[PDB]
Amino acid sequence: SKIPELWEKLSRKRNEFLDRAKHYARLTLPYLLNEPGNNESAQNGWQGTGAQATNHLANKLAQVLFPAQRSFTKLATVFAKIETQAMKALDARQFRPAVVEAFKHLLVAGNCMLYKPVKSANDPAGPISCIPMHHYAVQRDTNGQLMDIILLQEKALRTFEPALRAVINVKLYTHACYEGDGFWKVQQSADDLPVGKSSRVKADKLPFMVLTWKRSYGEDWGRPLCEDYSGDLFVVQFLSEAVARGAALMADIKYLIRPGAQTDVEHFVNSGTGEVITGVEEDIHIVQLGKYADLTPIDAVLEKYVRRIGVVFMMEVEQSLGGAYSLFSVTMQQPMAIWGLQENAAELDKLAQFSNYMNLPTTWPEWAQDAIKPTEYMDWVRGQISADFPFLMS
Amino acid sequence: SKIPELWEKLSRKRNEFLDRAKHYARLTLPYLLNEPGNNESAQNGWQGTGAQATNHLANKLAQVLFPAQRSFTKLATVFAKIETQAMKALDARQFRPAVVEAFKHLLVAGNCMLYKPVKSANDPAGPISCIPMHHYAVQRDTNGQLMDIILLQEKALRTFEPALRAVINVKLYTHACYEGDGFWKVQQSADDLPVGKSSRVKADKLPFMVLTWKRSYGEDWGRPLCEDYSGDLFVVQFLSEAVARGAALMADIKYLIRPGAQTDVEHFVNSGTGEVITGVEEDIHIVQLGKYADLTPIDAVLEKYVRRIGVVFMMEVEQSLGGAYSLFSVTMQQPMAIWGLQENAAELDKLAQFSNYMNLPTTWPEWAQDAIKPTEYMDWVRGQISADFPFLMS
């Protein structure tokens, strides 16, 4: 009963980033930020480079960072199992569309949540939901620890497994804040009545996780990548509009006849394929609106700018972006792995190099091949390579 | 208790480099120096070459200098063991993004520190923090040894495992100063009340380390790479804005009509696709604003300047940079290796050349292959190669 005003005060500062995200989405991807009942169209606009570029970038990161085909001493078989059941459990949760939607949100808006619901009778799979920016709220301290999370869900009445439907389109809030020592108090509220029982949970077992693309110090919410090149995108839009408008204006036809033409237009017009008109050469001049134009050097600037944007968006990650790969290998891969393990219940090149280098004493002369100390030779070789080989005899 | 005024004095000393760093970040990467409550955007402005170039350089140095895949006679195996352990300690500490952020500061701001937090249950990983230049304070002697270190941190009330909450958003200071023999006093204070106990530590046990890009003689703060080419960046920005403004001016059309035209615009406009207008060809020009311009040779100078900046940024480290690798040889891997080992608690080419050289006496005739003493031959070839081979018999 004390939840909604916290959501309001969080939205009070969420509003600025929401407005910025809406403005940036209008330029590149209009249909991502569409509030319920808004329906702010989805037309791409004058320039199409931004939409295709961001789609390609998000998809490329989704494929490389999360390969679909592959997963991302006596206990080796046990580890192989654990990984296999973990991957099978994730594949049953249908997370890849959620991953690509999240990547799109980070590129366009900058923040979104991945929420994993508990298994339910109506939806046994319980797929991961990509909650967009406007439908949650996060309160973060100066250091960067996530103090408060509030998630808003709008669900139908006949959507809950237990007899809660008996006790009662309904919107509910899930509020989680940790009191300290890695312990989060979580609570559920339905409109005004606090439903369920508040739970004390380890941070690992948190039923949702937060992605931020690009966070500055002392900022509660992140920033998108398109924010960094809005200016270039606007320049591309302006130049594309100019060139298209010039082409259309020149495409029009208007005709012209000189006054005192000494010829009659009706006879010139109201017939076809030949006939005798007895007129003047200079009459009927075929003018067009934009005969002269200057759209020649415009294309050079337009192609320069679009080429620069494509170079930015990789139309090569470790050498181009790199930091995104490492950052998401920590902030995103690790929570996914933890979820995978909890739902259920570099060096070989050294071996290859050692094999290549140790094959040498084979063609040596017999008097030279002999009088060699095996164990210490191999131990020195593996020490120089610095490889953990429990293989050879002592 | 007597901490804050020293921090104020050191901040007064730092203000000059802080202002220079903010001005430099305005050119390329605005968001690096973002104090809480500033939020000075992240626009590239007129030109975006500098931001992309510095991102690429910082990322590539982070990748090469700290390879992600790999680590950066009888007892040798044991050594290997501990090495892996150290890397494991670094893998559970999530240091790579901190390294990337530190390189970004070094390229733009030029100084920062890496701080290792004490293990706590609120954040059990305890990631290394990349504290920027403006939060901390450093005072050094004329020789260059670190005299005084001040750290400012801000956390919520429920972020301390011990009874610090019982004794009472809070900001705290950490002071570090030695009296000699590598004996450092470290103290913690909260606003006015000194908390904890003044701890005496060795130099190695210090939980933070300082980064400098180039430090000059008698200087308390380093200088960034962007300092040397801020002028070139400004020139590129000027030429880019000139080109963009010229293109925008040329894009606009203005239209014209000659006085005494003998034709009327009202009938010339309010229709389309054909018509006869009874006008004059000499009328109606489509003039545009920047018809003539001289922007063609500007592109040449812009390309030369951007190519020079790219070559300097070398978008070959041993060949081009060289000094950075040598400096970080002592600056980073030594302290990071010490950290990794303490958390827990060249020559083979000579062998290949030797094997190649001793292969020769296998095709010599019987009267020639013999009559050579093997042990002295082995010792002599080893000595001429000047290697330590524990293989051959005495």
Which residues of chain B make contact with A290, given a CB cutoff of 8 A? 253, 286
Q: How far is A154 from chain B (nearest CA, A)?
A: 32
For A301, the enclosing helix (H) or strand (E) is helix A298-313
Q: Is B21 exposed, middle or buried (0-12, 13-18, 19+ CB in 10 A)?
A: buried
Resolution in A: 4.0
Is there a contact between A294 and B272 if contact means CB atoms under 8 Å apart? no
CA atoms of A190 and A243, how far apart (whole Å): 54
Sheet of B129-131: strands edge to edge? B129-131, B111-115, B208-212
B51, B56, B390: residue with CB nearest A380: B390
H-only helix segments in B329-365: 334-344, 348-358
Q: Which of A225, A247, A354 is nearest to A298 (CA)?
A: A247
In a 13 Å sphere around the CA of A225, the CA atoms on its Cβ side amount to 19
Non-local (6+) Cβ contacts of A223 within 8 A are A110, A213, A214, A215, A216, B31, B42
Is there a contact between B70 and A365 if contact means CB atoms under 8 Å apart? no
Give strand pairing partners of A178.
A184
Is there a contact between B156 and A145 if contact means CB atoms under 8 Å apart? yes
**DSSP SS3 for B80:** helix
For A202, the enclosing helix (H) or strand (E) is strand A193-202
Which residues of chain B make contact with A373, given a CB cutoff of 8 A? 390-391, 393
Is there a contact between A231 and B277 if contact means CB atoms under 8 Å apart? no
Residue type, A342: Q
CA atoms of A92 and A340, how far apart (whole Å): 11
Sheet of B146-155: strands edge to edge? B137-140, B146-155, B170-178, B184-190, B193-201
| B30, B33, B35, B36 alpha-carbon torsion, rounded to 10° | 60
Is there a contact between B80 and A388 if contact means CB atoms under 8 Å apart? yes
Which residues of chain A make contact with B274, given a CB cutoff of 8 A? 253-255
Q: How far is A367 from chain B (nearest CA, A)?
A: 7
Which residues of chain B make contact with A142, given a CB cutoff of 8 A? 36, 154-155, 169
Q: Which of A204, A337, A177, A211 is nearest to B121 (CA)?
A: A204
> How distant is the alpha carbon of residue B103 from its chain centre?
1
Minimum Cα–Cα distance from A242: chain B residue: B251
- Which of A206, A264, A326 would best serve as a mutation to test chain B binding (most B beta carbons within 10 A)? A326
- Which of B59, B104, B239 would best serve as a mutation to test chain A binding (most A beta carbons within 10 A)? B59
Report the sign of the C-alpha dihedral through residues A94, A95, A100, A105, in that order.
Answer: positive
Cβ neighbour number for residue A95 with a 10 Å cutoff: 19
Is there a contact between A256 and B281 if contact means CB atoms under 8 Å apart? yes
CA atoms of B394 and A371, how far apart (whole Å): 10
Which residues of chain A make contact with B276, given a CB cutoff of 8 A? 255-257, 265
How many residues belong to chain B? Answer: 394
CB A95 within 8 A of CB A127: yes
Q: How far is B338 from chain A (nearest CA, A)?
A: 19
- Residues of chain A immediately before an interruption (C to N > 2.5 Å): 72, 168, 315, 345
CA atoms of A166 and B394, how far apart (whole Å): 92
Q: Is B119 exposed, middle or buried (0-12, 13-18, 19+ CB in 10 A)?
A: exposed
CB B29 within 8 A of CB B104: yes
Minimum Cα–Cα distance from A20: chain B residue: B41
Q: Which of A89, A46, A71, A382 is nearest to A241 (CA)?
A: A46
Kindly state the tokens that stand for B373. 């003493």
Beta strands in chain B (DSSP E): 111-115, 129-131, 137-140, 146-155, 170-178, 184-190, 193-201, 208-212
CB A306 within 8 A of CB A234: no
- Phi, psi dihedral angles at A7 (to 5 degrees): -60, -40
Which residues of chain A make contact with B69, given a CB cutoff of 8 A? 346
Give strand pairing partners of B188.
B174, B195
Kindly state the tokens that stand for B295. 């922007």
H-only helix segments in B252-333: 265-269, 296-313, 323-328
CB B133 within 8 A of CB B111: yes
Residue type, A145: Q
Minimum Cα–Cα distance from B364: chain A residue: A365
Q: Which of A196, A155, A152, A203 is nearest to A177 (CA)?
A: A203
Q: Which of A304, A129, A15, A133 is nearest to B247 (CA)?
A: A304
CA atoms of A98 and A113, how far apart (whole Å): 10
- Provide the angle, in degrees to the nearest 10, between the axes of the packed helices A298-313 and A230-251: 140
Which residues of chain B make contact with A239, given a CB cutoff of 8 A? 247, 251
CB A46 within 8 A of CB A241: yes
In a 13 Å sphere around the CA of A274, the CA atoms on its Cβ side amount to 1
CB A285 within 8 A of CB A257: yes
CA atoms of A243 and A102, how far apart (whole Å): 35
Is there a contact between A388 and B248 if contact means CB atoms under 8 Å apart? no
Q: How far is B241 from chain A (nearest CA, A)?
A: 11
For B144, the enclosing helix (H) or strand (E) is none
- Which of B54, B63, B128 would best serve as a mutation to test chain A binding (most A beta carbons within 10 A)? B63
